[PDB]
Design a binder for this molecule. Sequence first.
Ligand SMILES: *[C@@H]1O[C@H](CO)[C@@H](O[C@@H]2O[C@H](CO)[C@@H](O)[C@H](O)[C@H]2NC(C)=O)[C@H](O)[C@H]1NC(C)=O
Ligand SMILES: *[C@@H]1O[C@H](CO)[C@@H](O[C@@H]2O[C@H](CO)[C@@H](O)[C@H](O)[C@H]2NC(C)=O)[C@H](O)[C@H]1NC(C)=O
Ligand SMILES: *[C@@H]1O[C@H](CO)[C@@H](O[C@@H]2O[C@H](CO)[C@@H](O)[C@H](O)[C@H]2NC(C)=O)[C@H](O)[C@H]1NC(C)=O
Ligand SMILES: *[C@@H]1O[C@H](CO)[C@@H](O)[C@H](O)[C@H]1NC(C)=O
Ligand SMILES: *[C@@H]1O[C@H](CO)[C@@H](O)[C@H](O)[C@H]1NC(C)=O
Ligand SMILES: *[C@@H]1O[C@H](CO)[C@@H](O)[C@H](O)[C@H]1NC(C)=O
Ligand SMILES: *[C@@H]1O[C@H](CO)[C@@H](O)[C@H](O)[C@H]1NC(C)=O
Ligand SMILES: *[C@@H]1O[C@H](CO)[C@@H](O)[C@H](O)[C@H]1NC(C)=O
Ligand SMILES: *[C@@H]1O[C@H](CO)[C@@H](O)[C@H](O)[C@H]1NC(C)=O
Ligand SMILES: *[C@@H]1O[C@H](CO)[C@@H](O)[C@H](O)[C@H]1NC(C)=O
Ligand SMILES: *[C@@H]1O[C@H](CO)[C@@H](O)[C@H](O)[C@H]1NC(C)=O
Ligand SMILES: *[C@@H]1O[C@H](CO)[C@@H](O)[C@H](O)[C@H]1NC(C)=O
Ligand SMILES: *[C@@H]1O[C@H](CO)[C@@H](O)[C@H](O)[C@H]1NC(C)=O
Lengths: 49, 508, 48, 410, 48
Amino acid sequence: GWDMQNVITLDTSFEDAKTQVQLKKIHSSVILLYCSKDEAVLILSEARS
Amino acid sequence: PALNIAVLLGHSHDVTERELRNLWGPEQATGLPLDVNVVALLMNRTDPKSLITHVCDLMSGARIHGLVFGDDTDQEAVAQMLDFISSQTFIPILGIHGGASMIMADKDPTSTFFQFGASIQQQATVMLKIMQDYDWHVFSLVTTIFPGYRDFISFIKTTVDNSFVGWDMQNVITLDTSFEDAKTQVQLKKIHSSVILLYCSKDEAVLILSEARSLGLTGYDFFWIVPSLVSGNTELIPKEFPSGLISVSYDDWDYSLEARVRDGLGILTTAASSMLEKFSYIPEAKASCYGQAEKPETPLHTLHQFMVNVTWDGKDLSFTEEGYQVHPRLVVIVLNKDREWEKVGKWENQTLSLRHAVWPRYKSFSDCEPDDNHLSIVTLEEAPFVIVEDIDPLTETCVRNTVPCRKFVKINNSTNEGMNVKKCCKGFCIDILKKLSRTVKFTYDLYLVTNGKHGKKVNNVWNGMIGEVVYQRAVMAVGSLTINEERSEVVDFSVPFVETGISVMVSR
Amino acid sequence: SDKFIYATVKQSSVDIYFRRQVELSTMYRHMEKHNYESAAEAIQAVRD
Amino acid sequence: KIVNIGAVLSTRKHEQMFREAVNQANKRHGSWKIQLNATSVTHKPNAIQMALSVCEDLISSQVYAILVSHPPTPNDHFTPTPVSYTAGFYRIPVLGLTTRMSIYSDKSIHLSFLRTVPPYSHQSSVWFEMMRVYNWNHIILLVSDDHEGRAAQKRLETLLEERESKAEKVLQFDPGTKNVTALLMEARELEARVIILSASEDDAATVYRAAAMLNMTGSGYVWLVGEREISGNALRYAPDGIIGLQLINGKNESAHISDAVGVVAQAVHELLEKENITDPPRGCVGNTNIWKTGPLFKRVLMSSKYADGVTGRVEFNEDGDRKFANYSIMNLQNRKLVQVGIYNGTHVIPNDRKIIWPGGETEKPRGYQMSTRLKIVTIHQEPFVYVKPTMSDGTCKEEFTVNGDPVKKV
Amino acid sequence: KFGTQERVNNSNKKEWNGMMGELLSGQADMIVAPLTINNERAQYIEFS
Ligand SMILES: *[C@@H]1O[C@H](CO)[C@@H](O[C@@H]2O[C@H](CO)[C@@H](O)[C@H](O)[C@H]2NC(C)=O)[C@H](O)[C@H]1NC(C)=O
Ligand SMILES: *[C@@H]1O[C@H](CO)[C@@H](O[C@@H]2O[C@H](CO)[C@@H](O)[C@H](O)[C@H]2NC(C)=O)[C@H](O)[C@H]1NC(C)=O
Ligand SMILES: *[C@@H]1O[C@H](CO)[C@@H](O[C@@H]2O[C@H](CO)[C@@H](O)[C@H](O)[C@H]2NC(C)=O)[C@H](O)[C@H]1NC(C)=O
Ligand SMILES: *[C@@H]1O[C@H](CO)[C@@H](O)[C@H](O)[C@H]1NC(C)=O
Ligand SMILES: *[C@@H]1O[C@H](CO)[C@@H](O)[C@H](O)[C@H]1NC(C)=O
Ligand SMILES: *[C@@H]1O[C@H](CO)[C@@H](O)[C@H](O)[C@H]1NC(C)=O
Ligand SMILES: *[C@@H]1O[C@H](CO)[C@@H](O)[C@H](O)[C@H]1NC(C)=O
Ligand SMILES: *[C@@H]1O[C@H](CO)[C@@H](O)[C@H](O)[C@H]1NC(C)=O
Ligand SMILES: *[C@@H]1O[C@H](CO)[C@@H](O)[C@H](O)[C@H]1NC(C)=O
Ligand SMILES: *[C@@H]1O[C@H](CO)[C@@H](O)[C@H](O)[C@H]1NC(C)=O
Ligand SMILES: *[C@@H]1O[C@H](CO)[C@@H](O)[C@H](O)[C@H]1NC(C)=O
Ligand SMILES: *[C@@H]1O[C@H](CO)[C@@H](O)[C@H](O)[C@H]1NC(C)=O
Ligand SMILES: *[C@@H]1O[C@H](CO)[C@@H](O)[C@H](O)[C@H]1NC(C)=O
């Protein structure tokens, strides 16, 4: 009974108008991330913000 | 008795002194016990020394018992100065246009200076009325340390706490400083899809809206409602203002300057007449501004308590204790797709009349994502499935388990046009539609069909809900719509969610 | 209907309960026009 | 190169010492780059005359800031209002030396106005600290209905909202009311015994006199007041044991002149290191446009921290008022004010003096006194609350149940 | 009246009437009566 809410792909930059309305769509308590370490740093900083 | 009223204006307007004098020539017994000797004057520019000298010369020479000041520039300081002058001369001054019309917060208790404007409280009331009329109950509140922000926030909180409407005020954000540096992005990033009441200055609203666009806060579903403070001069419009930026302001389109001067003269004349009926006579003006007269100088009778009960020819131009108009001429304007402030609604005798019954979607910018999750849905009233009722008398908004729906009701059979009245629709099909909106994640603009009745092909033309759907006037037809061979040929039906054949009912 | 008339005490807990309920709203609109000032008066009206 | 600074001052010797302070600041900073000229004007009895004089003398001299202070005459009915308006037309910053009214904190009215003394509303902050020190949670406000009382009330409630607590009652009376016994009688029936007053000297005297007759100044009551309520006529009728505040240098003209001149000189020097700086307007008549860098100059002034001031560390908050001022808490013991502690910038620190609370007792009175006479409300419900008319003697007939026990009636 | 939050005709202000208003306005310190416990009343006063 998995509940896979949404698939988010951050094709653009991690600070523009996109990847903000996309990242705000996360209402679940578990986030499965996939990226490089360098992109992970930026994505996690944005998520913390 | 003779009442001398002075009218000070600027060269920016084309009105002449002869026209100002002729404005008080209606000759239908405007003043029953008194006549008004209007004296006009035009000033090149407004500044402390020359303004004071002009007013003092008017009081000394013309012995004016009042004043009607109309400024051309946008100097908010002038109003304050006028108030000061009034407190030093007891001359009832009226702020008509320009800087003198910008509502000042706390006037001197001993000063008789009234303004033709709307305070921040009235603008906030109109904004909340817009939000209630368009069912934007959930909203945020972004303010800055601009003066008067505390009063705006306090009034918004008080009105929210003392209303039967939902008013889910999500959060209050106060950008102290460094909008782009830090400590402000964190606050602005927690604002979700909602209405954002913004209170700041125009040169600062530009920065705030630029940052909001950079944070993706200016989509189709974000409605920025702002007071007249940031809209300011309608002629100049920054490129950072999103289209659909709802604002409220004192109307400078319909309320002409001549009408303003006529209304001010009428207010002063009616107050003087009421004083004549109640008190003995018109108090003579002060001797002079200068000289340092040794006296308390407080007049035995003044017009302060007689401007609260004023009724001109047709309008009720009464003032409040603080000096605000009880019935201001407020207008709700939006920034349409042409990047020009287009008047939408008006605020008359404590009622907000809006042109657009349903809010039109405005493309905020050229690169905005297209509107695809918003659908237009037709519906026809059927007794068990779609029940259409009026708005709740208590909360003045659509009740629980019910959704807004605009019915195009004609004024009468005489006219060939009508108005869209926002009624409340419920029932089986409406519950199905609500569940579909929740599951498929789409928003809808429900509206009753007025062309036909359930659909029929007359002259190879479909009417009713089927006609609306086939002619692309709607995305879907939620209602008591029966699946048919011809209808399925014309439109695409979903799965039948209730079995409805044809059956015969007889009296037992 | 207009034949079976029923109500309760105006400005009381049951009035709030019927106002809050979502299904019974219709019959709430039936009671708002007949609500009595006090329970004793309503009981007397039921009695006669 | 020469930079003008204007000062509307009470007396000629004050203008002379202002010139001396300007010369000292010029020597300290260095007059090689910019020389600070100093023009001064004595106050005028007529407000219109003063608003004309600031245009003819200060504005026509192309000043950068105006330092305004109260006149020597004890009347203080918003004296800097002309200047703060006229120099507010061009957004020229105005420094208030000894004007503690709370109207000037409204930046929507006085567009360009700073001051080195906090307004009378910030005294409420001190009161809050006392509530944190002596653990008083139930209070009664007696603010006046004018702008000052409303501002003090708003500031105190804003402070209390952080504590998630509210004042028991906020009684408002119109300024200059001869009879105020109604509000005091309303206050007496409450539970809170911490009475906080914010009113002018005459209104404070009236409240003190009307509370003396009601025996509300006795033991168990504690009065917290400001500086106006323990100065002048209000001190003549002040109840003993009242606790009031006194600004350390609120009435000192020379220290405020010196520190204001120092901070404005530092701000001028800092401003003239920026680009596209615009000269101030010259003369009111014929110049209807605001000073372009006026708002920038005010923003510089509000963000400047004077290091060594005669009155202390000069710092302006967002409202342009003085921040972190020293309040000398005073208690009226034996018809004489004695300092029972001092409120520094953030905290109250007491001293060796013993506080004599109203009534003469030395132990700290409790915040309130719990009432054991509850006002009960009931509604006529037949099974629960039977209600019957009384007989002619004031009671109603005693009955008995089936068991013979008497029914208890009230 | 037992008590119900009603809109006063001026300024559209919520106000409690009856026992609820009497208790919240300080005129009474306790309500010993058949006062039903519900969510609407419990937000402003507290029941035993
Ligand atoms: C500041 O410079 C101005 C000249 O730019 C001086 O203003 C005049 O000074 C004389 C002598 O003090 C006065 O008699 C005049 O009345 C002033 N002119 C005006 C405005 O009427 C001013 O004195 C200089 N400040 C000082 C005292 O050094
Ligand atoms: C001040 O006002 C109060 C309240 O009105 C007065 O107190 C009572 O007022 C009623 C009338 O409302 C009188 O009938 C009573 O005799 C008053 N009782 C007293 C003496 O407290 C109070 O008298 C007024 N005081 C003055 C001097 O004006
Ligand atoms: C004076 O104001 C200061 C803040 O400016 C108060 O804060 C104290 O500052 C001293 C500086 O050495 C610290 O050691 C204390 O720890 C601070 N207060 C406490 C108790 O935390 C100070 O309380 C005020 N009065 C004093 C005692 O100077
Ligand atoms: C307005 O400008 C005109 C033309 O310069 C001048 O003659 C007139 O004196 C000015 N107004 C006044 C009365 O100051
Ligand atoms: C004053 O206000 C009253 C309110 O009823 C109104 O009836 C009356 O006409 C007003 N006074 C005038 C305009 O005579
Ligand atoms: C404005 O609307 C109110 C409410 O219907 C009404 O009482 C009032 O008379 C109206 N005023 C006018 C003259 O439009
Ligand atoms: C008036 O009503 C009739 C139907 O009785 C309709 O046919 C006619 O079009 C109406 N008038 C208009 C809208 O012109
Ligand atoms: C107009 O409205 C009136 C309201 O009574 C109605 O009786 C009439 O039939 C309508 N038609 C006309 C004459 O426009
Ligand atoms: C104190 O004052 C009150 C005012 O009503 C009075 O009733 C009481 O008797 C007085 N008590 C003393 C100390 O006599
Ligand atoms: C004012 O302050 C100065 C400097 O601290 C001091 O020399 C002077 O005595 C003070 N005057 C009064 C009366 O406070
Ligand atoms: C100062 O003004 C000049 C124009 O004279 C402008 O080019 C420059 O950018 C300004 N300095 C600032 C605000 O960066
Ligand atoms: C306040 O009081 C202290 C006592 O030592 C004094 O030294 C200091 O200058 C004052 N500071 C402020 C905040 O004015
Ligand atoms: C309006 O409210 C006041 C105060 O509750 C009340 O006295 C008055 O009767 C009300 N008027 C009507 C009929 O709504």
